[PDB]
Design a binder for this molecule. Structure first.
Ligand SMILES: [Ca+2]
Ligand SMILES: [Ca+2]
Length: 85
């Protein structure tokens, strides 16, 4: 295959699986605000810990201050692609 899709495809699933897995040696199956900020930076540019921490505490208040793969997979799946570039 000449073309490739790193979004809403198997490539995205594996990419994120290893991304969170490698950044989760504690084996918690989740990532804290700080951890999420590191992986999120790859999707955006380079935000501040205080900024990301505020979004995590506001986006994750009905659960906790951690991130679950299911949440990221659901959001990326509902968006259809999220990023265009
Ligand atoms: Ca962890
Ligand atoms: Ca949550």
């Amino acid at each position: 295959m000449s073309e490739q899709k790193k979004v809403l495809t198997a490539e995205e699933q594996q990419e994120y699986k290893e991304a969170f897995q490698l950044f989760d040696k504690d084996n918690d199956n989740k990532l804290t605000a700080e951890e999420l900020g590191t992986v999120m930076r790859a999707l955006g540019a380079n935000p501040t810990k205080q900024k990301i921490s505020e979004i995590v505490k506001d986006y994750d208040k009905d659960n906790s201050g951690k991130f679950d793969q299911e949440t990221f997979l659901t959001i990326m799946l509902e968006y259809g692609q999220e990023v265009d570039s």
